[PDB]
Coordinates of C-alpha atoms in Angstrom, one line a residue:
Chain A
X1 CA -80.1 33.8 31.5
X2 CA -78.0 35.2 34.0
X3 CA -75.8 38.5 34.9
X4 CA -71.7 39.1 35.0
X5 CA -69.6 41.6 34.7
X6 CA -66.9 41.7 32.1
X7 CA -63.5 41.4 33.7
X8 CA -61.5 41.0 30.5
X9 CA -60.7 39.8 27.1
X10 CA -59.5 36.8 25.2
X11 CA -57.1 37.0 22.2
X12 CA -56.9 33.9 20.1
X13 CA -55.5 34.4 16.3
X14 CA -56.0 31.4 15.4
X15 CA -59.5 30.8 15.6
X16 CA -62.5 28.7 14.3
X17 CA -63.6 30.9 11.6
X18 CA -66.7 30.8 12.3
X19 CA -66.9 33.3 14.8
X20 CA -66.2 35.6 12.5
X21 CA -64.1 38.7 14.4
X22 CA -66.5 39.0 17.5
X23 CA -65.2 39.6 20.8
X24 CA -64.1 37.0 23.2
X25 CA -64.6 38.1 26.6
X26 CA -63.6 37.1 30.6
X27 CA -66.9 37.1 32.3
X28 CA -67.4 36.5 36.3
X29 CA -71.3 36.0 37.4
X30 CA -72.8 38.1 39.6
X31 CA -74.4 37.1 42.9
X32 CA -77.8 38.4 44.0
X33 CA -76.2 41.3 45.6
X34 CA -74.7 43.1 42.7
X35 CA -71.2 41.4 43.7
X36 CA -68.5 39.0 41.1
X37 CA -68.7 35.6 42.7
X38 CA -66.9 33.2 41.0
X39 CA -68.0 31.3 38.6
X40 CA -65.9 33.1 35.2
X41 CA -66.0 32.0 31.6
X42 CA -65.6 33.4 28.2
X43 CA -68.4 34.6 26.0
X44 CA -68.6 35.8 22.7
X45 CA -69.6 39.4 21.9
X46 CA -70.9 41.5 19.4
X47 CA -72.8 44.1 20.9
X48 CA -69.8 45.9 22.0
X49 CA -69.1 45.2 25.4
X50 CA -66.6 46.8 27.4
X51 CA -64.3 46.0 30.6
X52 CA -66.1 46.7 34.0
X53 CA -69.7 46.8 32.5
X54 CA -72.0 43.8 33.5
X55 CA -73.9 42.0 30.6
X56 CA -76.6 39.2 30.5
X57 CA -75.7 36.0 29.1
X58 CA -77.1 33.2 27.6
X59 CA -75.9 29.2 27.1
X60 CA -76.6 26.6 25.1
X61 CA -78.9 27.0 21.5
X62 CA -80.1 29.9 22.9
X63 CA -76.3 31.2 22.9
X64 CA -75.6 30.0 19.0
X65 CA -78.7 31.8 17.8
X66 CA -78.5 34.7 19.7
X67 CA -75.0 35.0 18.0
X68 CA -75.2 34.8 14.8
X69 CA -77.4 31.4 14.3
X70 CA -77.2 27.6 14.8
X71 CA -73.9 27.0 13.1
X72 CA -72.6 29.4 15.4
X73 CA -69.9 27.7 17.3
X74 CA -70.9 29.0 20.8
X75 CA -72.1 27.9 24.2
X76 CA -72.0 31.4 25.9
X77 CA -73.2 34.7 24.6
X78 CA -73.9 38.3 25.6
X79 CA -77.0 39.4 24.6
X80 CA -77.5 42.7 26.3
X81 CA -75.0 45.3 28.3
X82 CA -76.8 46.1 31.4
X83 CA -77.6 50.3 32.8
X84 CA -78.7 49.4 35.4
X85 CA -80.1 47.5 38.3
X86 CA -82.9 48.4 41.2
X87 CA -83.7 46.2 44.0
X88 CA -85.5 47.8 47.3
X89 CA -86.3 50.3 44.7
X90 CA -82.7 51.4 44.7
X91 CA -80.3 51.2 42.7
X92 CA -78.2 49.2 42.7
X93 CA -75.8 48.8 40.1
X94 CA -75.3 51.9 37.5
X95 CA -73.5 52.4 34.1
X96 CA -71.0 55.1 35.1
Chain B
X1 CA -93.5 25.8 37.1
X2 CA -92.3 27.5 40.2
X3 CA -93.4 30.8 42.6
X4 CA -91.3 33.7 42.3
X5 CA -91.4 37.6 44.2
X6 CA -90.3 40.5 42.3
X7 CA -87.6 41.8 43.4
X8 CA -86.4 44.2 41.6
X9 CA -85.4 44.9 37.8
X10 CA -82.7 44.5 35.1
X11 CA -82.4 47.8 32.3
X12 CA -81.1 46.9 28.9
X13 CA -81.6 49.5 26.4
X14 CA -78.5 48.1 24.2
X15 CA -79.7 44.0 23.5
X16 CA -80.2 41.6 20.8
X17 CA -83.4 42.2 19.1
X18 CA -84.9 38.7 19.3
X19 CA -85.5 39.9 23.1
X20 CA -88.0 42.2 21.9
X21 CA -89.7 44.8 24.7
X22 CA -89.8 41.6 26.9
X23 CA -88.3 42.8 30.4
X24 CA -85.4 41.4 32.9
X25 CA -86.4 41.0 36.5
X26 CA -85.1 39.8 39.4
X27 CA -87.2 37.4 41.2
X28 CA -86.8 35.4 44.5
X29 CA -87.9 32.2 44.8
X30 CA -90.8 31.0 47.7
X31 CA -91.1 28.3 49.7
X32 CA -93.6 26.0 50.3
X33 CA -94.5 27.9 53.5
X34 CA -95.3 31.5 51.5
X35 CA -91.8 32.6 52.2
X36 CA -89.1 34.0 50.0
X37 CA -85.9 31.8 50.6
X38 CA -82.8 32.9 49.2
X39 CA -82.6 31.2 45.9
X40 CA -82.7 34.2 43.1
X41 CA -82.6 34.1 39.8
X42 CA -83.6 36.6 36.3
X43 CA -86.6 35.9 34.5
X44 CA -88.0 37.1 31.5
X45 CA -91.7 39.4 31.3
X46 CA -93.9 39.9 28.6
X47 CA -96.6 40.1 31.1
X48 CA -95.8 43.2 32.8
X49 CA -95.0 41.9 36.8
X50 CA -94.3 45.1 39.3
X51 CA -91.8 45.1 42.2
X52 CA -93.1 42.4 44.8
X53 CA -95.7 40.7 42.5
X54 CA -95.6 37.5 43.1
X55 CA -95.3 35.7 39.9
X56 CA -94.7 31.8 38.0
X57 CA -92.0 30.7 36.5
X58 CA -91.2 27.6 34.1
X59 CA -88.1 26.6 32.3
X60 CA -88.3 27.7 28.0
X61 CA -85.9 29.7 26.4
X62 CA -82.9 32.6 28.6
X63 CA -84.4 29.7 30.8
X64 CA -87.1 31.5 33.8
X65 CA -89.3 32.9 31.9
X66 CA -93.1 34.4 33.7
X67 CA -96.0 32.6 32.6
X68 CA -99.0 34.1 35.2
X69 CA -99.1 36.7 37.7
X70 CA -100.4 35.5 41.5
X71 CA -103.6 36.5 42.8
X72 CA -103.5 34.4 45.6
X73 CA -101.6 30.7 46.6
X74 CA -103.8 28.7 49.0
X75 CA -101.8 25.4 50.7
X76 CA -103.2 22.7 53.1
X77 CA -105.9 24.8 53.7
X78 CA -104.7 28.0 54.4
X79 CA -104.1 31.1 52.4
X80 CA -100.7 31.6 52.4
X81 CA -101.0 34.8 49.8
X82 CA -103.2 37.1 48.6
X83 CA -102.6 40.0 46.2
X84 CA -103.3 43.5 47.8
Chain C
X1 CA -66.6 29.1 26.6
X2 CA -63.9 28.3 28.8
X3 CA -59.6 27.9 29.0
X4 CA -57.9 25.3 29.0
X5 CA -54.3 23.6 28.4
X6 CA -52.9 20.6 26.4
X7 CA -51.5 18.1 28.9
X8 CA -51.7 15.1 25.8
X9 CA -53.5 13.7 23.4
X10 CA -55.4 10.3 22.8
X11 CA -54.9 7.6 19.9
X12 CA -58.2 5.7 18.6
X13 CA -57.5 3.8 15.7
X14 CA -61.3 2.6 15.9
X15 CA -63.6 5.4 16.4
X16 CA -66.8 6.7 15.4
X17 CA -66.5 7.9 11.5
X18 CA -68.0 11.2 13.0
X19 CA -64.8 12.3 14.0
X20 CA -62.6 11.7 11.0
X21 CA -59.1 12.0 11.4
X22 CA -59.1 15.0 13.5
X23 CA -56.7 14.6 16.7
X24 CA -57.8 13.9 20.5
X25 CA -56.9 16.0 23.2
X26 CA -56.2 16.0 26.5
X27 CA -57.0 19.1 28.2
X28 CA -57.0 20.5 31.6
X29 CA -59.3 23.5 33.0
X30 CA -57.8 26.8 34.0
X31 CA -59.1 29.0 36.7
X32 CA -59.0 32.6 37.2
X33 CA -55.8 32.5 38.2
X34 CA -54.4 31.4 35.0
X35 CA -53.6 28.2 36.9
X36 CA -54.9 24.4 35.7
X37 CA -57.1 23.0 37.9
X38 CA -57.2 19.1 38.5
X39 CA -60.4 18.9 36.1
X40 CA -59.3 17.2 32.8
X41 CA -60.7 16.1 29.7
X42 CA -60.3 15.3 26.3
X43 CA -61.8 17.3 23.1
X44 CA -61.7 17.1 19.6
X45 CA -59.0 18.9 18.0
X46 CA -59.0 19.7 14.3
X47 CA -56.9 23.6 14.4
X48 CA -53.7 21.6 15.4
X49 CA -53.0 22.5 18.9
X50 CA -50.0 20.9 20.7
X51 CA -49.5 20.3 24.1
X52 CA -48.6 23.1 26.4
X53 CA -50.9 25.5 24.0
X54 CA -53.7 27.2 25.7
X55 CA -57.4 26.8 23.9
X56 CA -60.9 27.7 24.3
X57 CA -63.3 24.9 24.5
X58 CA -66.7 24.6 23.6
X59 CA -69.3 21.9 25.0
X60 CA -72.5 20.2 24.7
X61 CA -74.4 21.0 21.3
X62 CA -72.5 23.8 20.4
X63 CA -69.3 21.6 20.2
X64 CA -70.8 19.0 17.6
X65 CA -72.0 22.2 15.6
X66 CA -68.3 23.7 16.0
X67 CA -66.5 20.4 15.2
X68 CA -69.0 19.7 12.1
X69 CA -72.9 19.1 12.2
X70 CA -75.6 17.6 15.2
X71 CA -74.4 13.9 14.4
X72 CA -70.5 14.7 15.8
X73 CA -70.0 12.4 18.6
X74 CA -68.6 14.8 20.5
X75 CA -69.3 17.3 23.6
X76 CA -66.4 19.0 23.8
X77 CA -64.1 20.9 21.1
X78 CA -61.2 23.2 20.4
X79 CA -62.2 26.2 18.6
X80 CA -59.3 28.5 19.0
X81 CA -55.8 28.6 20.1
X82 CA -55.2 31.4 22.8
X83 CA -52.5 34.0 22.6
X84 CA -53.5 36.0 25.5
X85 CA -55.6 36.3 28.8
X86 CA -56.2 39.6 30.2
X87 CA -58.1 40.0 33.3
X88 CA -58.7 42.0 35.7
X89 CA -56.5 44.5 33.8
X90 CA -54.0 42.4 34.5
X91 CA -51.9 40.4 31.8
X92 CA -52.2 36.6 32.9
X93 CA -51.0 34.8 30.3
X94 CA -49.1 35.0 27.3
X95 CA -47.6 32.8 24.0
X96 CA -44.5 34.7 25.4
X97 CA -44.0 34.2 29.0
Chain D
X1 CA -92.9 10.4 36.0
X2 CA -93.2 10.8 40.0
X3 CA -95.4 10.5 42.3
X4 CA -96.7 13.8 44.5
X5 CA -100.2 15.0 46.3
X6 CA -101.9 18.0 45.8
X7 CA -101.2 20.6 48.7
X8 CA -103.2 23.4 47.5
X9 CA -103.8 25.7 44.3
X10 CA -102.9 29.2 43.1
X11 CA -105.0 31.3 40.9
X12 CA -103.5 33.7 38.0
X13 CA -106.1 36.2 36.2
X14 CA -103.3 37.5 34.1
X15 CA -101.5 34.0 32.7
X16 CA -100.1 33.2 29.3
X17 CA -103.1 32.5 27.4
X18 CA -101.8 28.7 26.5
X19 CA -102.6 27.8 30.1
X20 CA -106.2 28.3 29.5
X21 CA -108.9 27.6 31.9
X22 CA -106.7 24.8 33.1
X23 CA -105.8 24.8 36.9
X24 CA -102.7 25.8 38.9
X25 CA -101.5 23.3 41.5
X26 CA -99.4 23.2 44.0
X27 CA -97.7 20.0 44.5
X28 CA -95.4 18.5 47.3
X29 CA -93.0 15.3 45.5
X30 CA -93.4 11.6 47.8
X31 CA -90.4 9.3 48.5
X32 CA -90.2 5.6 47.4
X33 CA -92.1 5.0 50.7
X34 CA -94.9 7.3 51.2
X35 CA -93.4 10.6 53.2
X36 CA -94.0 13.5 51.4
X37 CA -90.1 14.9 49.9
X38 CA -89.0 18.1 50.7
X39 CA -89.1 19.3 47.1
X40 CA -92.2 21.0 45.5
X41 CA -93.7 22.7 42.7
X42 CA -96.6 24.1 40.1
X43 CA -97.9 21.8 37.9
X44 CA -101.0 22.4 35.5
X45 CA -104.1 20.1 35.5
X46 CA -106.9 19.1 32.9
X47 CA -107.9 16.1 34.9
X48 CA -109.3 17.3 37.7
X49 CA -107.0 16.8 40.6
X50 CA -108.3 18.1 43.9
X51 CA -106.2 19.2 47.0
X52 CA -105.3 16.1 49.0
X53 CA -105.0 13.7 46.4
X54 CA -102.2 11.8 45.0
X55 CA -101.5 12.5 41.2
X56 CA -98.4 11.1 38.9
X57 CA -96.5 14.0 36.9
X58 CA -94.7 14.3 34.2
X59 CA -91.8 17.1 33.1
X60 CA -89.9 19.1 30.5
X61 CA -91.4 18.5 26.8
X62 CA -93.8 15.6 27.6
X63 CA -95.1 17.6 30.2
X64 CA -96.3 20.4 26.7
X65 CA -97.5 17.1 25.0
X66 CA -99.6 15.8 27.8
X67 CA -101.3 19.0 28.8
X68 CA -102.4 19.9 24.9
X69 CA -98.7 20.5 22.5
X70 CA -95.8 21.8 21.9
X71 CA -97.9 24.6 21.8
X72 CA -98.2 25.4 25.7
X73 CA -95.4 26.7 27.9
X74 CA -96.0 24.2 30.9
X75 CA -92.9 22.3 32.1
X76 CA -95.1 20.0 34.6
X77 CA -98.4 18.2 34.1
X78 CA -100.7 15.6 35.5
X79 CA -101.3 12.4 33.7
X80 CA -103.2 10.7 36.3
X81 CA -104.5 10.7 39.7
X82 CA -103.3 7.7 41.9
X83 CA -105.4 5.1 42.7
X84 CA -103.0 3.1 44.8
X85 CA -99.5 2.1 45.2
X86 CA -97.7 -0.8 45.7
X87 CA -94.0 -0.8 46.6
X88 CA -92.1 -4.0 47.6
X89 CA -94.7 -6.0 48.6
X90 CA -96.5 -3.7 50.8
X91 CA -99.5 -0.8 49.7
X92 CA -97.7 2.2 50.5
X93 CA -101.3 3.6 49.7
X94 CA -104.8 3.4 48.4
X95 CA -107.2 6.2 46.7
X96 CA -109.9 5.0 49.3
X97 CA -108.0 6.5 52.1
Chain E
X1 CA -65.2 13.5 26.5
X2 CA -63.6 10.7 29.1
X3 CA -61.8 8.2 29.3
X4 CA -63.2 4.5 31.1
X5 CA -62.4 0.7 31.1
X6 CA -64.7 -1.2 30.3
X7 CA -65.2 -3.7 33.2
X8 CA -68.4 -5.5 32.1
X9 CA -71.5 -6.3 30.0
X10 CA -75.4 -5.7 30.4
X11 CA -77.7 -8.3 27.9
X12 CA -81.0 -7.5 27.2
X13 CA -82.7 -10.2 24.7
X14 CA -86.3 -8.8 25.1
X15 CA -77.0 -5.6 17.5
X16 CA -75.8 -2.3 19.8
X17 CA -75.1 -3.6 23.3
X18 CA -74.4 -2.0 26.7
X19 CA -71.7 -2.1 28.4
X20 CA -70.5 -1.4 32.2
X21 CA -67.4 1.2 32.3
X22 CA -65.1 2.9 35.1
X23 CA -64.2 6.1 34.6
X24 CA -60.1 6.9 34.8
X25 CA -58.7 10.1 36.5
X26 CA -56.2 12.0 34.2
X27 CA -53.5 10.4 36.4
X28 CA -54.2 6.8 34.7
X29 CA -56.6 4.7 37.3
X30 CA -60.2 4.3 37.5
X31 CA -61.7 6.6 39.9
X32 CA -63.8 4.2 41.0
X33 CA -66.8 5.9 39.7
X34 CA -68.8 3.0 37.7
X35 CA -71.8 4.1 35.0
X36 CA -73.9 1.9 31.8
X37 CA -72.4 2.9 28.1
X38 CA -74.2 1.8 24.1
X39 CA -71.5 0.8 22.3
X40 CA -72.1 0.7 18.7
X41 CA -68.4 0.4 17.9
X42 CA -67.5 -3.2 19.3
X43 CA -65.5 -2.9 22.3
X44 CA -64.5 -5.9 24.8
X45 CA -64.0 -6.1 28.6
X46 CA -60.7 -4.9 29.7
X47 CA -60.5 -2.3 27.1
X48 CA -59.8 1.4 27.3
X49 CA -62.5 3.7 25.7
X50 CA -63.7 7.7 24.9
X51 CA -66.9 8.4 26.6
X52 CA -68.8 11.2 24.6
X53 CA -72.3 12.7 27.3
X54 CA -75.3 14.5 25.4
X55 CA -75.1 11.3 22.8
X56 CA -78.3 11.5 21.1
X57 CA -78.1 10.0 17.4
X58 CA -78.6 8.6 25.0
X59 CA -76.3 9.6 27.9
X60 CA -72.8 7.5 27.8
X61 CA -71.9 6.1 24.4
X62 CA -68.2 4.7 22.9
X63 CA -66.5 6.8 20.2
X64 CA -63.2 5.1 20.1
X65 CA -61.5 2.4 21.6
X66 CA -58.5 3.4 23.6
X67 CA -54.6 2.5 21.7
X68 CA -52.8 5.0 23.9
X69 CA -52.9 7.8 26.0
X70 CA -49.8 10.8 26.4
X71 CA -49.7 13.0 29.3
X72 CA -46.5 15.1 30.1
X73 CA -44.8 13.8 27.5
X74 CA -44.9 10.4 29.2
X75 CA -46.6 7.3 27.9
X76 CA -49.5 6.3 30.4
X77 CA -51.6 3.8 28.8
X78 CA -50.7 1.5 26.0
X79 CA -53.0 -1.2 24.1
Chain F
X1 CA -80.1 5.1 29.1
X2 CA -80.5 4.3 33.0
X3 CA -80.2 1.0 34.6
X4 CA -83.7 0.5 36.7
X5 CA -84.7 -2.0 39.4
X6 CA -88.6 -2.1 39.6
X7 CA -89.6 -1.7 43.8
X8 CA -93.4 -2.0 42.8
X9 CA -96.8 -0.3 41.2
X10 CA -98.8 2.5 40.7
X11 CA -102.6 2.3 39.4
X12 CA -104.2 5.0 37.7
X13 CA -107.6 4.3 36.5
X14 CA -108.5 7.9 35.6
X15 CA -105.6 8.7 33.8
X16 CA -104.3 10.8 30.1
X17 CA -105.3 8.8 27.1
X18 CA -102.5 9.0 25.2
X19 CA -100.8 6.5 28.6
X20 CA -103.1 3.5 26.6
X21 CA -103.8 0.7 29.4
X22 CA -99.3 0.0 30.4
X23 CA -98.8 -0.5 33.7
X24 CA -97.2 2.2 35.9
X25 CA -93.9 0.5 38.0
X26 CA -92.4 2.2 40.5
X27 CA -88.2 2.1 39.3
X28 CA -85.2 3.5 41.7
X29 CA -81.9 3.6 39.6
X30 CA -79.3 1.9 40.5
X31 CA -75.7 0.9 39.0
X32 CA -74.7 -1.8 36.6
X33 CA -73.6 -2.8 40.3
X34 CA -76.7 -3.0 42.1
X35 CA -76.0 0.2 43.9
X36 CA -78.9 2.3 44.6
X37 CA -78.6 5.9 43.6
X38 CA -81.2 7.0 45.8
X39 CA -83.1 8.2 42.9
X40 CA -86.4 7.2 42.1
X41 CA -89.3 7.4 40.0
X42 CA -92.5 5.5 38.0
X43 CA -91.7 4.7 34.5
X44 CA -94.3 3.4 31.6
X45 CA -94.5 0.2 30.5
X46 CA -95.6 -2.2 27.7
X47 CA -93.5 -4.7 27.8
X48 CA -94.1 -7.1 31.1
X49 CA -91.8 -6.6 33.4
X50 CA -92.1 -7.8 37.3
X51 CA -91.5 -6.6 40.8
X52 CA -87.8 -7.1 41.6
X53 CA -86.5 -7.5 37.9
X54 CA -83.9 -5.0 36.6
X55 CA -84.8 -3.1 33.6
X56 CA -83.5 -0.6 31.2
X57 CA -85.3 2.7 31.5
X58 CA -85.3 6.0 28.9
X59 CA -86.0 9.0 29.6
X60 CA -86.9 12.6 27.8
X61 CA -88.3 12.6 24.8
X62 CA -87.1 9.6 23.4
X63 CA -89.2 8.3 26.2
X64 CA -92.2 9.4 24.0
X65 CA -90.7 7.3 20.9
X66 CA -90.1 4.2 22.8
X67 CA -93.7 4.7 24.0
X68 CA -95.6 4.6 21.1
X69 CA -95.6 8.2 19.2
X70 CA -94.9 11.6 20.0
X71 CA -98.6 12.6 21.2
X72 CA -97.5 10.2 24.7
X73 CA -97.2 11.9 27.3
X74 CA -94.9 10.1 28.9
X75 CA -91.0 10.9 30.3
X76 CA -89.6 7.4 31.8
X77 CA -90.2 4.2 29.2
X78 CA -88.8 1.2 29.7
X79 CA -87.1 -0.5 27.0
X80 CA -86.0 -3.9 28.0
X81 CA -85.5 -6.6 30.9
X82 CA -81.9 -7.5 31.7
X83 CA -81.3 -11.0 31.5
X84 CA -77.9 -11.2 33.2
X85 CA -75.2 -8.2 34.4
X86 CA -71.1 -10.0 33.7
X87 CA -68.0 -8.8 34.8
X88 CA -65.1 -10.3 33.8
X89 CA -67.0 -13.8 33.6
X90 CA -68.5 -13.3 36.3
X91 CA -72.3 -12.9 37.0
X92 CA -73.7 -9.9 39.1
X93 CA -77.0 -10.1 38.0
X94 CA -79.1 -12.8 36.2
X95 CA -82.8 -12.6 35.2
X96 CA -85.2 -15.6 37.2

């Protein structure tokens, strides 16, 4: 499990069919400090994810299931869209 | 497993259902000594760990996940935590 | 997921029966940027991508599930063909130019 | 498995209920020739390591089979408390020490 | 996957054998990085071969023996 | 699978069960080369292999498998004894 931001989108036509018509987004990890490092990827969405807003993600089986199920042909998925985030007990990170 | 601080939170009120009420923190690993390092990380709660609980963590699945909540670490024979 | 581009492809007239017929790719790794980076691989290809074509690529258990079931010997595959990349608000690459 | 000795313990009232009444300990990894590595960990025990000693571990699903099943959430067990070791003809160390 | 040569043999009497590759760099030569592979499929010393990870049915294991290779539209490797 | 050369022996006499009476051998990985990879560990055994020899380790759980069953707790098994390493004809490695 780990946080990014979502910097952007992917648009493939010609696609493996099953991922349906989810989203196929540019993520960039975040580092401990709320900032985009650079570690970037694409992940699937269907939670409705926009650009700007920082998600958590998740690899693997834990990616395929959290997509659709195991057929699902995905390493990387967004399984949440983020608030917010508090440290010190401040915030950090808001959804504005 | 692994010892982790608290600190701080992750809110998610829009998230795939298999995540249940669990909740997202931020955790810092410690080292041997009793000290955070800088090594952070997210880890999953179903326990209920405040802000600067110390905490373990083991790899399941998604992959820290909070097993235990510290009361107290001793090393080569010295208490090197102890929750207040 | 990540990009990638079509620098070739691979010929294995004895392979694993796993694979069937599909085709083998070469493909290198594309940062940010929307440049390739020196990291190169090959995947399995069964969408009919051609060199110079940009593709997402899948790995590890997810790309034997994408290519066909969990007894495809195979850890990386093509599971799209890309038309664009936008990042950063910006347009970096296009089928165009 | 690896070798490692037993540099303390740590105590949870509130744990996941598969760990039991087992114990918590804290455990420093040992190099091919005795020194105590740099890396270090929790690991559960049923056998009844105590602080000082040298135990063998074992990891990832084995580690859920060895403390009860598939059933716990531990990632690191002990198997068995070290006796003595022998590495290229020399003992690198002996329980009675 | 990868690409390797084969460049040995391991035997282990106490069917599928194991062999000893070296990886090659997308330019053509072996990197010089050297690692153990099952081959199931009945490849020889000297030969070119695809190197799937994660093999499970462990780590390194043949899926094709090597008849050529294209890169920029220029023949690199050829049986 | 993981070439293995065995640098010794562990004894455990209060040990898990499941371990039966295999010897414990101390095993740093190493290349079909010789080459040392720095890595090292203590993997089961039932087969009868001897300080110095070069052996083929597996780890995981297909460790438990080779072992006996899954209820082993085990993560390092060792599945044979090489009895010679070639190379082009030539012999890097041949079992005494």
């Amino acid at each position: 499990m780990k946080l990014a931001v979502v910097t952007g989108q992917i648009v493939c036509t010609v696609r493996h069919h099953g991922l349906a018509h989810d989203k196929l987004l540019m993520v960039e990890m975040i580092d401990p400090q709320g900032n985009p490092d650079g570690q970037c990827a694409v992940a699937i969405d269907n939670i409705g994810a926009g650009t700007g807003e920082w998600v958590l993600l998740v690899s693997g089986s834990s990616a395929r299931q959290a997509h659709k199920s195991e057929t699902s042909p995905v390493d990387l998925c967004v399984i949440g869209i983020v608030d917010e985030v508090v440290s010190g007990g401040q915030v950090i990170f808001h959804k504005l």
